[PDB]
XYZ file of N, CA and C in Angstrom:
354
model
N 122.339 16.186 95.895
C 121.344 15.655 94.971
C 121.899 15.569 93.551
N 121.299 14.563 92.768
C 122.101 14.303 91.381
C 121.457 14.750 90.454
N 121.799 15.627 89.302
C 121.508 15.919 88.446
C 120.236 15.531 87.924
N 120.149 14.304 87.455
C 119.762 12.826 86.616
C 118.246 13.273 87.839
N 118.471 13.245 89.043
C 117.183 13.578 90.220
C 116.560 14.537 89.700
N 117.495 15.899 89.791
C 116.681 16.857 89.598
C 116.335 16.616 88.489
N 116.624 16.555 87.355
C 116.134 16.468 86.132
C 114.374 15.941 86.037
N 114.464 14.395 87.169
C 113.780 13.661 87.450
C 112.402 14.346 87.786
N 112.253 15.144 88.980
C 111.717 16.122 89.047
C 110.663 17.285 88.455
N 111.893 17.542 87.751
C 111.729 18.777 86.357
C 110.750 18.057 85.594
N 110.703 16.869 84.997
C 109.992 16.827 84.039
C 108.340 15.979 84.895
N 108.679 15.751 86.023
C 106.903 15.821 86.903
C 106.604 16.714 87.418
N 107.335 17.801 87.196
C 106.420 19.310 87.906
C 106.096 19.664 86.039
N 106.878 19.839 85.215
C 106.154 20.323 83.221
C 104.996 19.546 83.443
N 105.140 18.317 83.564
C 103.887 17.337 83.538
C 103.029 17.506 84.028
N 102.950 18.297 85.547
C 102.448 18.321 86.472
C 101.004 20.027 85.815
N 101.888 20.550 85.564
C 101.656 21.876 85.054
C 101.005 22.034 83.470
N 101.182 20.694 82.440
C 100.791 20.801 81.102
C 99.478 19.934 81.639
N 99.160 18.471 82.744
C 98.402 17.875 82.893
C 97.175 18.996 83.652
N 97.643 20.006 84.217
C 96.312 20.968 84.589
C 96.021 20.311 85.882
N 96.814 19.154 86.232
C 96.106 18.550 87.893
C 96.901 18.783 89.335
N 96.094 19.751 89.847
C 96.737 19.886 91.367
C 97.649 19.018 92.231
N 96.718 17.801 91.953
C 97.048 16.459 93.169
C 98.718 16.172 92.432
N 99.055 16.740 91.349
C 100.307 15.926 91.556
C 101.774 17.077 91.701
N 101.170 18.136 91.981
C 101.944 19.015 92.516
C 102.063 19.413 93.716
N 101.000 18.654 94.715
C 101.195 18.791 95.928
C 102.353 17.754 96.650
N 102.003 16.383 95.737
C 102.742 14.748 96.118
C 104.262 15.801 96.242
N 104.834 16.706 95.577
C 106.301 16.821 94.587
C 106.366 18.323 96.251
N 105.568 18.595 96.472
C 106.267 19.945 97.514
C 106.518 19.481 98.737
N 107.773 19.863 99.660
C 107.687 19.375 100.724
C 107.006 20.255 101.647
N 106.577 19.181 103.025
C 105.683 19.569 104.082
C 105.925 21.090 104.836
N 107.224 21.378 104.223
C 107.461 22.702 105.293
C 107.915 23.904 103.630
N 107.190 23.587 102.399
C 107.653 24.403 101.736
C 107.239 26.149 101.946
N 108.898 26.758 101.440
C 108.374 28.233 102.292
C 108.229 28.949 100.363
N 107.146 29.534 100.197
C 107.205 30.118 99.193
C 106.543 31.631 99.094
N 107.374 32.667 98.086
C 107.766 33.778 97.750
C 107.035 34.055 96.568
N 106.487 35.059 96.792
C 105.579 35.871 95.853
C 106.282 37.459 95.938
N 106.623 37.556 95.320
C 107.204 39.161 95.718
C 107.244 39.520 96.619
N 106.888 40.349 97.514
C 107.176 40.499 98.775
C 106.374 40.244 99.723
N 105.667 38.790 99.552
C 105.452 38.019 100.414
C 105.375 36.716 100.487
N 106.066 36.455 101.628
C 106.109 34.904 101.716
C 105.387 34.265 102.992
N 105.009 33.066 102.509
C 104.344 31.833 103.713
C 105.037 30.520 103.138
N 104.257 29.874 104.110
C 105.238 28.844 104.088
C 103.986 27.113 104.560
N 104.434 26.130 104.136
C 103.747 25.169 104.220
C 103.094 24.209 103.217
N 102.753 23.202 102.962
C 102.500 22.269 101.550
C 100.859 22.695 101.964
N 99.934 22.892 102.849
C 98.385 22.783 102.824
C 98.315 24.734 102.459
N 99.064 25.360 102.875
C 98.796 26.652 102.361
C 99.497 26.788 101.460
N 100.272 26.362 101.002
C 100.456 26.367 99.079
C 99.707 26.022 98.317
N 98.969 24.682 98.547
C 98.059 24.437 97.719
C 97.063 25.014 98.019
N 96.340 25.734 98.529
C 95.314 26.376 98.442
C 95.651 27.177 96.945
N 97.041 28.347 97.006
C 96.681 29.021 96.412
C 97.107 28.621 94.672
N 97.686 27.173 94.480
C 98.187 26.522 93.013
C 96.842 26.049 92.876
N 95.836 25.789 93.783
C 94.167 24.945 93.061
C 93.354 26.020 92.651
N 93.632 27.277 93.433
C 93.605 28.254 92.986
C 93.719 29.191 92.057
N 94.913 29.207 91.633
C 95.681 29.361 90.332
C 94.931 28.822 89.211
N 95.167 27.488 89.100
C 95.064 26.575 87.837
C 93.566 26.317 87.789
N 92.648 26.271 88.706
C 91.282 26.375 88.653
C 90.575 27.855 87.756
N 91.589 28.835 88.172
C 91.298 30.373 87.559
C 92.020 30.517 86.134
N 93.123 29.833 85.796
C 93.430 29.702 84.454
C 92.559 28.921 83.530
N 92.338 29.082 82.679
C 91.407 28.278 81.368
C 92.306 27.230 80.756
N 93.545 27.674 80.438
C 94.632 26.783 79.863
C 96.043 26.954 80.651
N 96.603 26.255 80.839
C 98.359 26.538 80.916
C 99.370 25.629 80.220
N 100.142 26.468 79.671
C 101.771 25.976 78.860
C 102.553 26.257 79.558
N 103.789 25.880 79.799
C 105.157 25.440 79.784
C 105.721 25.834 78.640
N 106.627 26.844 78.367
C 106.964 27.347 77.268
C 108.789 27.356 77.868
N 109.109 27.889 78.874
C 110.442 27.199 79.295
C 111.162 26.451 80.255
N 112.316 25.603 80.416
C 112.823 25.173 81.561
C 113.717 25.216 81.489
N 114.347 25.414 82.532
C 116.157 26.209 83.043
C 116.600 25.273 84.331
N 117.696 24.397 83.941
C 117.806 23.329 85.540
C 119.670 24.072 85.650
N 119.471 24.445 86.839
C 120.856 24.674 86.999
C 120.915 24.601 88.557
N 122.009 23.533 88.955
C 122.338 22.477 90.437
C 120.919 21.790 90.814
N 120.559 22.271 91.841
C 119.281 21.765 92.112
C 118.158 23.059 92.084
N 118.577 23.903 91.252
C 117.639 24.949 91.118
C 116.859 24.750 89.845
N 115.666 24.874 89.617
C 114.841 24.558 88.220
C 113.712 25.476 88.146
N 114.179 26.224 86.792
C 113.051 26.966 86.208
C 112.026 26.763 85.446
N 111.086 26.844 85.726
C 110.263 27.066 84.175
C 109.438 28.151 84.486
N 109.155 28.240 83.156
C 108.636 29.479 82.264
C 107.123 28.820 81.996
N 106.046 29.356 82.596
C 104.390 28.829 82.399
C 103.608 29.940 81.765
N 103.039 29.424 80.743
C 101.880 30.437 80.063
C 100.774 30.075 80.346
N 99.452 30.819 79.822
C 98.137 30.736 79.949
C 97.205 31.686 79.648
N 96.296 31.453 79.615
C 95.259 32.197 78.809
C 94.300 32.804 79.849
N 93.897 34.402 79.949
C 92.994 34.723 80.932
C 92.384 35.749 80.024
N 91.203 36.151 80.142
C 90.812 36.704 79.153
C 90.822 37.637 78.367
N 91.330 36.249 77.063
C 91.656 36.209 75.896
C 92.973 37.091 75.493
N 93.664 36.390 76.853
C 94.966 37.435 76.581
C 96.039 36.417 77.173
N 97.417 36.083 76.499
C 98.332 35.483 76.948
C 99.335 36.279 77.522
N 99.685 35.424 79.317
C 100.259 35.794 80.502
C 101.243 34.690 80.526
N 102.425 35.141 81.470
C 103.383 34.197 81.581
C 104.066 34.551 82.903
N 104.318 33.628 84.041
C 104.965 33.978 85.355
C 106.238 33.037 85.450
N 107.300 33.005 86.286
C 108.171 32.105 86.194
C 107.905 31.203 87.474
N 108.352 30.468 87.933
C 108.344 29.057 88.905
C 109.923 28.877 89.192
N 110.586 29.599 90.061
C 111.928 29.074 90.320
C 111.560 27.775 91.476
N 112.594 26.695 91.211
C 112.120 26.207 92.441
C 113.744 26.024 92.821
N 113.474 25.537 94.222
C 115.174 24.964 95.164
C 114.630 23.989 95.506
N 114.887 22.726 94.620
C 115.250 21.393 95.178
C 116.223 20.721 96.147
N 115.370 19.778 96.867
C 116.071 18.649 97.733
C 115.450 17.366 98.397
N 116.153 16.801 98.948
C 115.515 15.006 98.619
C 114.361 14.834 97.818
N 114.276 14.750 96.454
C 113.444 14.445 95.998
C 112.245 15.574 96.172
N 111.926 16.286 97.064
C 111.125 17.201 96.870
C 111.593 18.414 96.422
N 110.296 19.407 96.944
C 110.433 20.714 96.224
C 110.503 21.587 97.909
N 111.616 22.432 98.191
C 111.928 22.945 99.278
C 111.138 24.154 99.198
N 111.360 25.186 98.596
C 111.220 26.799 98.310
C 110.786 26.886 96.673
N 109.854 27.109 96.626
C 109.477 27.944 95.059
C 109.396 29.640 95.438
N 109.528 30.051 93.967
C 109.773 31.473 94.106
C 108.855 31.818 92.981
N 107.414 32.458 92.480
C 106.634 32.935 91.836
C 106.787 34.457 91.603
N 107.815 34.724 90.082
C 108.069 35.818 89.794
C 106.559 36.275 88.745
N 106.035 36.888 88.598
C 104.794 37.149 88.109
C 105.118 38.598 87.032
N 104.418 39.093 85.781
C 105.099 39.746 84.736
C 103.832 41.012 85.369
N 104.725 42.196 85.218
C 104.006 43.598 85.720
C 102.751 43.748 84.914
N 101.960 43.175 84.252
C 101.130 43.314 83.658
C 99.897 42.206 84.127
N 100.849 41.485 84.265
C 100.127 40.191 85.679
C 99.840 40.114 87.219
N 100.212 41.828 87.400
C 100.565 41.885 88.753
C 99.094 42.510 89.327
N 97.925 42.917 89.000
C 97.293 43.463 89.395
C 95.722 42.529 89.770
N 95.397 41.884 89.040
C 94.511 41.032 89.230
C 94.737 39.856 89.647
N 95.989 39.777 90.194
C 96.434 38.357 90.842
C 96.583 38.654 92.516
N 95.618 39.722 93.343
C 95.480 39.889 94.359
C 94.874 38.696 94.796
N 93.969 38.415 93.740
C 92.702 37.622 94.191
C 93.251 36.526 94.281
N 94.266 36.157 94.835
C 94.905 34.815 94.761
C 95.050 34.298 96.016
């Protein structure tokens, strides 16, 4: 995969994530994505999105504060507001054809307790 792709990518998942809308982060994951929450993982594009409409339905706001593209691996760094307190988790993802293979949701120890409900 080419750079210039991933890049491609990168900036419709920020978009995806500053626009606050589900539907276009599901188009970007592929059908068999396996994703990692600390020490647990599932796997699939209809049980991922459950828990990102989830997510972003339970956030009030979210930012994008960083992004890190290195091969076809791409980070960003997402903030948001829960009450009245700013949180921040990371989004590794592993790109390929054009989609999103594996995301990895590193979450900050202070974020780790009320995000059962997820």
């Amino acid at each position: 995969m080419t750079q210039e792709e991933v890049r491609k990518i990168m900036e419709k998942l920020k978009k995806a994530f500053k626009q606050g809308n589900p539907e276009q982060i599901v188009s970007l994951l592929s059908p068999d994505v396996r994703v990692k929450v600390g020490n647990q993982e599932f796997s699939g594009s209809e049980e991922a999105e459950k828990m990102w409409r989830k997510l972003m339905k339970f956030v009030d706001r979210v930012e994008v504060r960083r992004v890190k593209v290195d091969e076809n691996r791409v980070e960003i760094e997402v903030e948001f507001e829960v009450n009245g307190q700013r949180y921040s988790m990371e989004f590794h993802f592993e790109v390929e054809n054009g989609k999103v293979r594996r995301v990895e949701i590193r979450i900050s120890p202070t974020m780790k307790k009320l995000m059962k409900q997820i």
